[PDB]
Design an enzyme around this catalytic site. Structure first.
Site, PDB file in Angstrom:
ATOM      1  N   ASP A 152     -17.293 -38.050   7.919  1.00 62.30           N
ATOM      2  CA  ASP A 152     -18.328 -37.462   7.555  1.00 62.30           C
ATOM      3  C   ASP A 152     -19.051 -37.647   6.085  1.00 62.30           C
ATOM      4  O   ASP A 152     -19.229 -36.623   5.518  1.00 62.30           O
ATOM      5  CB  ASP A 152     -18.658 -35.841   8.232  1.00 62.30           C
ATOM      6  CG  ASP A 152     -19.961 -35.241   8.006  1.00 62.30           C
ATOM      7  OD1 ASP A 152     -21.190 -36.256   8.093  1.00 62.30           O
ATOM      8  OD2 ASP A 152     -20.222 -34.166   8.513  1.00 62.30           O
ATOM      9  N   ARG A 156     -24.588 -34.814   1.176  1.00 58.43           N
ATOM     10  CA  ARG A 156     -24.484 -33.049   1.707  1.00 58.43           C
ATOM     11  C   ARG A 156     -23.293 -32.567   1.695  1.00 58.43           C
ATOM     12  O   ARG A 156     -22.930 -31.317   1.402  1.00 58.43           O
ATOM     13  CB  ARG A 156     -25.177 -32.929   3.082  1.00 58.43           C
ATOM     14  CG  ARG A 156     -24.545 -33.675   3.985  1.00 58.43           C
ATOM     15  CD  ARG A 156     -24.790 -33.426   5.539  1.00 58.43           C
ATOM     16  NE  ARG A 156     -24.231 -34.299   6.635  1.00 58.43           N
ATOM     17  CZ  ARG A 156     -24.524 -35.487   6.848  1.00 58.43           C
ATOM     18  NH1 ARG A 156     -25.860 -35.927   6.168  1.00 58.43           N
ATOM     19  NH2 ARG A 156     -23.878 -36.344   7.654  1.00 58.43           N
ATOM     20  N   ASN A 157     -22.005 -33.368   1.728  1.00 56.52           N
ATOM     21  CA  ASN A 157     -20.667 -32.732   1.966  1.00 56.52           C
ATOM     22  C   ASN A 157     -20.049 -33.097   0.671  1.00 56.52           C
ATOM     23  O   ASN A 157     -18.947 -32.686   0.539  1.00 56.52           O
ATOM     24  CB  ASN A 157     -20.047 -33.629   3.098  1.00 56.52           C
ATOM     25  CG  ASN A 157     -20.545 -33.333   4.503  1.00 56.52           C
ATOM     26  OD1 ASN A 157     -20.616 -33.906   5.404  1.00 56.52           O
ATOM     27  ND2 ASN A 157     -21.216 -32.143   4.441  1.00 56.52           N
ATOM     28  N   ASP A 173     -16.486 -30.697   1.853  1.00 59.59           N
ATOM     29  CA  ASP A 173     -16.935 -30.366   3.437  1.00 59.59           C
ATOM     30  C   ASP A 173     -15.904 -31.109   4.256  1.00 59.59           C
ATOM     31  O   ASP A 173     -16.075 -32.396   4.338  1.00 59.59           O
ATOM     32  CB  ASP A 173     -18.204 -30.362   3.957  1.00 59.59           C
ATOM     33  CG  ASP A 173     -18.302 -29.970   5.264  1.00 59.59           C
ATOM     34  OD1 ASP A 173     -18.222 -30.412   6.439  1.00 59.59           O
ATOM     35  OD2 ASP A 173     -19.114 -28.604   5.320  1.00 59.59           O
TER      36      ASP A 173
END
Length: 303
Positions: A152, A156-157, A173
């Site tokens: 992922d 955003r992470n 994340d």
């Protein structure tokens, strides 16, 4: 306690540093999620500034196990470009994970908020973008070398230590990797929650994940970075992207994107995983872009 293995070592809850609840003060909310809150906090018995991630008290035993595993996973990494776990407070409710405070926030929000605007700002340059890219590539190389598939990689992470000069970007994340580690598949999610726009064909078609699937995602992250926080495949839905990508379609360069940077993206998006670069090579190529004055002297678009 459920176990966790990394780099040839098995760990459990008892190896996490429990910090006395009495030592933790919450200062302010940092924009909570739909499941769990995040706070700026302070640990002091010269107080240590922290991010505090909370577990909702109204949750299943599965949710609690998932929370414990997130703490384990993060705590066992040791790298500059992966957020540190300062400790946990699991022996009081709500349960806490204490993380390195990333005062620059998530990278997508950062890019959106800091992108050159026809007014007061326009204090971000190509070099800042290349530095974020190198930082994350370094983190990804570390994961690759330790046989950890992130699954992922996306803006955003990623998180920034601070908003200004001297910011360091870090992978912050690991929820997807945690989910697969616990369940063997995306049990908690479903098709609509899968980060399709970041996934290579063999991942979305066959469910095959390798470090080369992180390479592909990193290519998309690069596009996110150099587009200054645009959603990938802007005009397309997930299914449209699935069809577009499987048939050989790739994103165009972001506005003003230097050729050598876009070339890295297209390399990461090779249809065959064997044709994609590993992260050592990606790093070398980013560093070479950073050496090229014509690359770094390229102006970013003003909104």
């Amino acid at each position: 306690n459920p176990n966790y293995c990394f780099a040839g070592k098995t760990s459990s809850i008892s190896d996490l540093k429990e910090v006395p609840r009495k030592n933790i003060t919450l200062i302010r909310g940092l924009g909570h999620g739909a499941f769990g809150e995040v706070y700026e906090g302070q640990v002091s018995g010269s107080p240590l500034q922290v991010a505090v991630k909370t577990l909702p008290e109204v949750c299943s035993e599965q949710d609690e196990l998932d929370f414990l595993m997130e703490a384990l996973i993060i705590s066992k990494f040791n790298h500059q470009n992966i957020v540190r776990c300062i400790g946990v407070s699991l022996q009081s409710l709500p349960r806490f994970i204490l993380l390195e405070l990333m005062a620059g926030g998530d990278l997508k929000s950062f890019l959106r908020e800091t992108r050159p605007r026809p007014s007061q700002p326009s204090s971000l340059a190509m070099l800042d973008l290349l530095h974020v890219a190198r930082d994350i590539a370094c983190g990804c190389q570390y994961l690759e070398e330790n046989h950890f598939i992130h699954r992922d990689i996306a803006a955003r992470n990623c998180l920034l230590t601070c908003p200004g000069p001297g910011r360091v970007a870090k992978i912050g994340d690991f929820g997807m990797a945690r989910d697969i580690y616990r369940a063997g598949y995306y049990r908690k999610g479903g098709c609509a929650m899968l980060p399709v726009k970041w996934m290579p064909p063999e991942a979305f078609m066959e469910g095959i994940f390798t470090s080369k699937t992180d390479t592909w995602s990193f290519g998309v992250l690069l596009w996110e970075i150099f587009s200054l926080g645009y959603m990938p495949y802007p005009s397309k839905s997930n299914q449209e992207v699935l069809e577009f990508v499987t048939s050989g379609g790739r994103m165009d360069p972001p506005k003003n994107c230097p050729g050598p940077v876009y070339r890295i993206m297209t390399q990461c998006w090779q249809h065959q995983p064997e044709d994609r670069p590993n992260f050592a090579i990606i790093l070398e190529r980013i560093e070479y872009c950073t050496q090229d004055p014509d690359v770094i002297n390229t102006a970013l678009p003003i909104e």
